Amino acid sequence: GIISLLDEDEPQLKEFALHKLNAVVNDFWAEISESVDKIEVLYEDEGFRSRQFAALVASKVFYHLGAFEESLNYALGAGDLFNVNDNSEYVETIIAKCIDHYTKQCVENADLPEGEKKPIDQRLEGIVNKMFQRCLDDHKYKQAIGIALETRRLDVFEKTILESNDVPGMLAYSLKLCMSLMQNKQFRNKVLRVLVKIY
Amino acid sequence: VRRAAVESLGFILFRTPEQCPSVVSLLSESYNPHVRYGAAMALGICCAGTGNKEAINLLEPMTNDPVN
Amino acid sequence: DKKFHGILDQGEGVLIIFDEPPVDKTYEAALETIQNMSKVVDSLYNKAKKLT
Amino acid sequence: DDEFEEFPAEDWAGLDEDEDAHVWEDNWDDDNVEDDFSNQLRAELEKHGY
Amino acid sequence: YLASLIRSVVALHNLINNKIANRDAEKKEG
Amino acid sequence: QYYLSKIEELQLIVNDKSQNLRRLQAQRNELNAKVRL
Amino acid sequence: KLQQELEFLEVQEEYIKDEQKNLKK
Amino acid sequence: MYEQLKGEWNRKSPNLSKCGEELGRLKLVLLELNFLPTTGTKLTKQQLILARDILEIGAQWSILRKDIPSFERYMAQLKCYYFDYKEQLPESAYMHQLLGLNLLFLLSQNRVAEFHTELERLPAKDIQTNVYIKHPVSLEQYLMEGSYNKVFLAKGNIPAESYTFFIDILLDTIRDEIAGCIEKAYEKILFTEATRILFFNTPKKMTDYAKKRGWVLGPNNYYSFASQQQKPEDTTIPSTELAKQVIEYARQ
Amino acid sequence: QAAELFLDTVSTFTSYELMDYKTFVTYTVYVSMIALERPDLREKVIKGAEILEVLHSLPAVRQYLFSLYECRYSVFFQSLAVVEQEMKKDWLFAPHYRYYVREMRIHAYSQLLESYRSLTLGYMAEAFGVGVEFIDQELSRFIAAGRLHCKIDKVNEIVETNRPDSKNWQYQETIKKGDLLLNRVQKLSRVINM
Amino acid sequence: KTAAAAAEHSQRELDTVTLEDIKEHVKQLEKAVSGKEPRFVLRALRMLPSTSRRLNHYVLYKAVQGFFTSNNATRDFLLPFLEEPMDTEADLQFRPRTGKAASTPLLPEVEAYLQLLVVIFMMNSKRYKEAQKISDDLMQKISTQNRRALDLVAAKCYYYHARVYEFLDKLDVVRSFLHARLRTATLRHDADGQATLLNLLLRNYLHYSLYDQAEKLVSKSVFPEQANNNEWARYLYYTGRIKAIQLEYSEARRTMTNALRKAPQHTAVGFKQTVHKLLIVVELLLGEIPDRLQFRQPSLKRSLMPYFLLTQAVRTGNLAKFNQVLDQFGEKFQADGTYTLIIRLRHNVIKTGVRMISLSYSRISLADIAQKLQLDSPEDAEFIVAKAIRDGVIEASINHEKGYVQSKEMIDIYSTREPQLAFHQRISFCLDIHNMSVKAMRFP
């Protein structure tokens, strides 16, 4: 097993063993699914200069395992390597899960905004901002506003109408969404305040 | 409470006139004639000027129910 | 001929006489029910309707 | 409808005879080989002397 | 053996009858 | 629209389960009406 | 549009499934 | 790059200073490009050759030094490097013997799935020839069928690569197994019974047996303790499973 | 089934079809002997007046039939070997190794060791022929076959039977049938959902 | 010439009948697209292999040129790849799409079907490169189009794709495709596609004997219960085989009997042969006496006659006879992959005989058991009974005086309750049946 090459106390050997994991991820699953202990050892060995990409291949290990949320958390702790590539199906899965998490956290911290909020992670917020920002800048505003409303940010509709207003009927589209679809006033207040302030 | 609760549902559910007949498939046929009356009145209320085409079809059997 | 209730233990040179409880006919009746309620039905029905 | 020939379908190449061609139900003991019982009892009688 | 199994068998009979009816309906509707 | 598809599949599951759920209630109500008759 | 439409429809249908199931007992 | 391939490892390498040379070998030659592709590049084929040579050298060093972590690491590296079977390269020689030693010690670790799956990788390598690799197979076969002392005498020789320490580690596994088999439902265990017939004629093994497990020595005899009881049954887990059934068909 | 529909002593012809009425009776006796051991067989076949008459006609046939009925194994085994030899000379020899003598002695040994607990091998051998080793090997072979619910204490040469109580044996039968019908319902669960 | 002309006209008429079968398939997809119903799709896929055994290059080109009234990449691919015969006197009125039908773009479902039908036809013709190209085009098109109903098709499409690649020996290379489509199916909740891909992967690991990786993947991959019956049977059989290799014996017998029962009784002749051999070998190793009624299998007489002799040898305890018969007819055992297990049974025959004789006897002498099973050694007999008791297969114990073994006892608290405890899943079966009914009582 290649796990020994990571088990050696040689950082260069560890790095050599862990380069091509992100390339054999597609083909080899069982050997990587069983090696969770080794990648945990590498993650704990934070004195080695490949902690970030070790967390990345840990997220790959949890991709094998099926724990997309745990892989999201590991690539989160990695930080900047969460967004290595912006176009893949596993990327879409993890960003959808993270958007759901951000939506839930924003809803609860807006329903109880008087302090004591669940800590909005800097890493999670950064990747979230990057993702819906690129989804706004892809220049498809028939779906940019939809993915924004799914993201559930208080300022996101204001951002969408302040940026390039492609299909300027999007104003009326979001108007009818807030008039008919969004009606639960408790978390609707963000969309409602943006809507009143613009219209 | 049974007749009241089966009649005063169309006030809330007229936002879903398509779901007016779906939530009464047991109420309009229930062994309680007051429950059936409530279901009928509930569809009638929730569909004010709507050609639902389904509420009418489900209410047609109740137009000749043995209970007055 | 079941006219007696015992077992001849020749090694000990005796016969152990036992009082047999006959109220346990529920056991045999239940077995008969199992047999004539399952065999006559499952095989016939689900071999006639092999395709479903 | 397919016969699933993908699994190795080694049909039995004898095509010579059915050993139990009738409805006889065999048992694991029924197919042991011996000189039946009559000869064995005769040998028993002989070794006992009669 | 004779209540749980009997309930399971009668439920199985009902289900397989319903499945036969549904399959025949789906095949012969058109 | 893919999470929309997943929610639609969940709604389909709920509808399929509710079909016989409503039918059983209606037929048991019919049985109770029959015994009252 | 269809996103929240299906969300609300699923909420109502999942609710009514349980409510009508409550009558089985 | 390609330095002292077996310069001091063929005749005798008993010093600990060779660990540093091996580490430098790993840094320089073992990390040249890779071991994965092996498409062409006969240079990388020779790189695989030197990798498997240094792996067997490390295996011998580890089995002679009795370091479980290093030995297991070398075993896993050997397995991962051999995962690339290239038939055109000269097989055997290092293959059958090392695989036999590795599988034998893995059975001492109590793993049979890997043993049998490697046996299936090896259709005729294990049965037709290569006593080198069927020696562990024969040992396991006897130790599963009918033999303890016969297994010991069979273990007395290793044809694979000598290195008669896998037999001692299997002897440790079988002292554990025998201790379990006599902690089993046996009726009584005399002191001479434990000492003479099986193995371990009055060694420190005897004190280990007398002090570690139960069955306190009576008069020259160990006896079974309280393990079978009438158990007047409170019968509470039947009630719990009955309640589980009750709730199961109390709904839907 | 053969017995249940074959005890009927209403022949289409006085001596025809099965070569005779005597041959008909011999078939009846063989079939009944395969059939059961000794319940109210006295009131089923022994009470048969025509049966007693035809056993008077055939003394050796009457001999082994009465030997089985009386449970006298000393003559029973010799007569049973004679019966097997006779069945050899008969085209109806289908149970060549199953139900000539082995099944009949399975019934006989069940009858014998039942109402017994520990009958010594050496004495059951002379009460059942000769050759203590022959009876020991026969008992071992039949226990391996499955019947003869008992075990053998070889170090003391004893036959310790294990007859379940009515409850115990019937319990065992119910769990066997539960196994068979769980197999059946699992097959039916395969039938559904496909 | 009359007989040859009549035969050619009859075979052309059957070719037209097969073309009408394909036209019926096209109408079935038109109805399936109209009604959003994949069950009638499943019916079409079920009925295709029944007529698959007799097709003709000319009638396939007829169907291609008829259905592709509008120019399309499928027709452009089939034009060079499909090699129709020379000029034929029989022609049909090819005008299925006119006006709006020709204007509308081709259906992705029927495109996947034409691709899969071309690959099955190429394999029927015993062609490899064109089949692999058509299958690659199929997987490419299915990946590009993201409709829900397509992945249900994609299950069997990927199945037969990897079956073709197995003949191509690309069964190693197709693993990347299998895993990529596994990730797509994980994204799209395609349980049937997942089942197909794991079945193909397991057959790959079987053909390379990659059993350690196979078990490491099976122990972590959750398999859908509601999958297709055939895919379930194949997966369960492969799991049973790998457990048998892993010595998982009770689980192996459970899985193999379950797979035999799940397989269709009228079909799967090779699967049936394999499961008979598996049950024979594994249950003989267990000492679980093989089912005698299985010997009445009309398709397994010659294969089970040496298996019958193996059963007899297992019961008896002899060695030389079955070693001779293995040397005679053991090559098929090697082909089936049980010959290592065959020798394992050859040397565990004594274990099985010891279990049976221990069940037979109460207090049997160690000398007697050694004589019975050809040990000829009191110490070896003692070791064997020790090994049996430590394995826990039997209750025979050791008393170093003479070899005492305990007997049984009357029924205790749990001895009447273990059947109900192990059998009260009857209501669990009832509840899953009722839930399936609830799912399958659609009124319209």
Secondary structure in 3-state letters for chain A: CCHHHHHCCCHHHHHHHHHCHHHHCCCCCHHHHCCHHHHHHHHHCCCCCCHHHHHHHHHHHHHHHCCHHHHHHHHHHHCHHHHCCCCCHHHHHHHHHHHHHHHHHHHHHHHCCCCCCCCCCHHHHHHHHHHHHHHHHCCCHHHHHHHHHHHCCCCHHHHHHHCCCCCCCHHHHHHHHHHHHCCCHHHHHHHHHHHHHHC
Asked whether the beta carbons of A127 and A82 are under 8 A apart, the reply is: yes
Asked whether the beta carbons of A141 and A167 are under 8 A apart, the reply is: yes
- How far is I52 from I41, CA to CA, in rounded Å? 13
Provide the 3-class DSSP secondary structure of residue I64: helix
Query: Both tokens of residue H117?
Result: 């799956």
Residue of J nearest to E30 (CA): J31
B55, containing H or E segment: helix B55-59
> Measuring CA to CA, which residue among J366, J341, J365, J358 is closest to residue J393?
J358
- How far is H73 from A3, CA to CA, in rounded Å? 8
Residue D22, amino acid: H
Q: Give one word for I148, left, alpha or beta, with left for phi > 0 and alpha for psi -120 to 50.
A: left
Residue J247, amino acid: L
Q: Give one word for J378, left, alpha or beta, with left for phi > 0 and alpha for psi -120 to 50.
A: alpha
Least CB-CB distance to I160: which of J261, J368, J407? Answer: J407
> Sign (positive/negative) of CA torsion J214, J216, J217, J223?
positive
- Please work out, in degrees rounded to the nearest 5, the angle formed at the alpha carbon of residue H215 by the alpha carbons of H213 and H219: 130
Q: Quick one: J303 and J423 in the same domain?
A: no
Rounded to 10 degrees, the C-alpha dihedral I79/I83/I85/I89 comes to: 150
Question: How many other CB atoms sit within 10 Å of the CB of residue A81?
Answer: 17
> Measuring CA to CA, which residue among H29, H31, H19 is closest to residue H57?
H19
Asked whether the beta carbons of J223 and J185 are under 8 A apart, the reply is: no
Q: Quick one: J307 and J426 in the same domain?
A: no
Asked whether the beta carbons of H238 and J420 are under 8 A apart, the reply is: no
What is the DSSP-derived secondary structure letter of residue D37?
A: T
Asked whether the beta carbons of F1 and G2 are under 8 A apart, the reply is: yes
- How far is H149 from J131, CA to CA, in rounded Å? 61
- The tally of CA atoms less than 13 A away on the side-chain side of residue A120 is 19
For chain F, what's the residue count? 37
- How far is D35 from D25, CA to CA, in rounded Å? 21
For chain E, what's the residue count? 30
Burial of E13 (C-beta count, 10 Å sphere; 0-12/13-18/19+)? middle
**Which residue in this structure is represented by tokens 């539960």?**
I178
- How far is I51 from I28, CA to CA, in rounded Å? 9
Q: Give H142's contacts (C-beta < 8 A, 6+ positions apart).
A: H150, H151, H154
> Measuring CA to CA, which residue among H155, H82, H151 is closest to residue H114?
H82
Q: Which of I98, I100, I105 to mutate to test the interface with D (most CBs of D within 10 A)?
A: I98
- How far is C17 from H145, CA to CA, in rounded Å? 45
CB proximity E20 to J under 8 Å: no
Residue I120, φ and ψ in degrees, nearest 5: -65, 140
F7, containing H or E segment: helix F2-36
Q: Quick one: J259 and J356 in the same domain?
A: yes
J438 vs chain F: nearest CA distance in angstroms? 5
3-state per-residue secondary structure call for H131-175: HHHHHHHHHHHHHHHCCCHHHHHHHCCCCCCCCCCHHHHHHHHHH
Q: Which residues of A131-156 are buried (b: 16+ CB within 10 A; e: fewer)?
A: bbeebbeeeebeebbbbbbbbbbeeb
Q: Give E8's contacts (C-beta < 8 A, 6+ positions apart).
A: I185, J426, J427, J429, J430, J433
State the greatest distance between any 2 C-alpha atoms of chain I, in Å, as a whole number. 65
Provide the 3-class DSSP secondary structure of residue H17: coil
* Ordered strands of the I118-120 beta sheet: I118-120, I158-161, I150-153
- Please work out, in degrees rounded to the nearest 5, the angle formed at the alpha carbon of residue J331 by the alpha carbons of J330 and J332: 90
Least CB-CB distance to I97: which of D30, D47, D48? Answer: D30
Provide the 3-class DSSP secondary structure of residue B48: coil
> Sign (positive/negative) of CA torsion G13, G14, G19, G25?
positive
- Going by DSSP bridges, is the β-strand pair C6-9/I118-120 parallel, antiparallel, or unpaired? unpaired
Asked whether the beta carbons of J41 and J33 are under 8 A apart, the reply is: no
CB proximity H181 to J under 8 Å: yes
C-alpha separations of I49 from H220, I42, I56 in Å: 74, 12, 11
Query: Both tokens of residue H165?
Result: 């320490």
**Which residue in this structure is represented by tokens 């011999």?**
I26
Query: Both tokens of residue J244?
Result: 């048998």
Q: Give J43's contacts (C-beta < 8 A, 6+ positions apart).
A: E27, J28
Burial of J430 (C-beta count, 10 Å sphere; 0-12/13-18/19+)? buried
Asked whether the beta carbons of I132 and I172 are under 8 A apart, the reply is: no
Residue I161, φ and ψ in degrees, nearest 5: -75, 155
- The tally of CA atoms less than 13 A away on the side-chain side of residue J444 is 3
Q: In chain B, what residues touch G12 (CB-CB under 8 Å)?
A: 16, 19
What is the DSSP-derived secondary structure letter of residue B54?
A: S
**Which residue in this structure is represented by tokens 């170093």?**
J400
Asked whether the beta carbons of J67 and J114 are under 8 A apart, the reply is: yes
Asked whether the beta carbons of F21 and J439 are under 8 A apart, the reply is: no
E8, containing H or E segment: helix E4-28
Query: Both tokens of residue H198?
Result: 């099986």
Provide the 3-class DSSP secondary structure of residue J300: coil
Residue of G nearest to B23 (CA): G16
Q: Give I93's contacts (C-beta < 8 A, 6+ positions apart).
A: I87, I100
Query: Both tokens of residue J102?
Result: 């020709």
Query: Both tokens of residue I70?
Result: 């009386």
- How far is I16 from I24, CA to CA, in rounded Å? 9
Least CB-CB distance to H79: which of A1, A20, A24? Answer: A1
The DSSP-derived string for J216-280 is HHHTTPPPPTTS-HHHHHHHHHHHHHHHHHTT-HHHHHHHHHHHHHHS-SSS-HHHHHHHHHHHH
Q: Which residues of F5-18 are buried (b: 16+ CB within 10 A; e: fewer)?
A: bebbeebeebbebb
Provide the 3-class DSSP secondary structure of residue J412: coil
State the greatest distance between any 2 C-alpha atoms of chain F, in Å, as a whole number. 52
CB pairs under 8 A between A and J: 31
- How far is J230 from H99, CA to CA, in rounded Å? 38
- How far is H126 from J254, CA to CA, in rounded Å? 30
Q: In chain I, what residues touch J416 (CB-CB under 8 Å)?
A: 171
Q: According to the entry, how was the structure determined?
A: cryo-EM
Rounded to 10 degrees, the C-alpha dihedral J107/J112/J113/J118 comes to: 130
- How far is J215 from J246, CA to CA, in rounded Å? 9
Residue A85, amino acid: N
Asked whether the beta carbons of H55 and H81 are under 8 A apart, the reply is: yes
C-alpha separations of J373 from A122, H56, H151, I136, J321 in Å: 74, 43, 20, 17, 14
- How far is J357 from J364, CA to CA, in rounded Å? 8
G16 vs chain F: nearest CA distance in angstroms? 8
Query: Both tokens of residue G17?
Result: 């499934």
Residue H124, amino acid: A
Q: In chain A, what residues touch H69 (CB-CB under 8 Å)?
A: 7
Rounded to 10 degrees, the C-alpha dihedral J139/J140/J142/J144 comes to: 160
**Which residue in this structure is represented by tokens 């071992």?**
I140
Provide the 3-class DSSP secondary structure of residue I132: helix
Q: Give G15's contacts (C-beta < 8 A, 6+ positions apart).
A: none
Q: Quick one: J255 and J349 in the same domain?
A: yes
- How far is J400 from J403, CA to CA, in rounded Å? 6
J407, containing H or E segment: none
Do residue A89 and residue J216 have CB atoms under 8 angstroms apart?
no
Asked whether the beta carbons of A189 and A113 are under 8 A apart, the reply is: no
C-alpha separations of H104 from H95, H110, H133, J254 in Å: 14, 9, 9, 30
- How far is C15 from I116, CA to CA, in rounded Å? 8
Q: Quick one: J361 and J250 in the same domain?
A: yes
- How far is E3 from I61, CA to CA, in rounded Å? 51
> Measuring CA to CA, which residue among J387, J378, J312, J405 is closest to residue J351?
J387
Burial of J192 (C-beta count, 10 Å sphere; 0-12/13-18/19+)? buried
CA H75 to chain centre: 11
Asked whether the beta carbons of J374 and J320 are under 8 A apart, the reply is: no
- How far is I30 from I100, CA to CA, in rounded Å? 9
- How far is J139 from J179, CA to CA, in rounded Å? 13
H-only helix segments in H66-94? 68-82
The DSSP-derived string for H157-224 is --TTT--TTHHHHHHHHHHHHHHHHHHSS-SEEEHHIIIIIIS-SSSHHHHHHHHHSSS-B-SSEEE-
Asked whether the beta carbons of J302 and D12 are under 8 A apart, the reply is: yes
C-alpha separations of A189 from A109, A153, A183, A185, H50 in Å: 13, 11, 9, 6, 69
| Sequence ranges of the domains in chain D | 1-48
CA I109 to chain centre: 9
Asked whether the beta carbons of D36 and I96 are under 8 A apart, the reply is: yes
CB proximity G11 to F under 8 Å: no
Q: Quick one: J306 and J246 in the same domain?
A: yes
Residue of C nearest to I39 (CA): C1
Q: In chain E, what residues touch J40 (CB-CB under 8 Å)?
A: 26
Question: How many other CB atoms sit within 10 Å of the CB of residue J128?
Answer: 16
CB proximity J3 to H under 8 Å: no
Burial of I44 (C-beta count, 10 Å sphere; 0-12/13-18/19+)? middle
Domain holding J425, by residue range, is 407-441
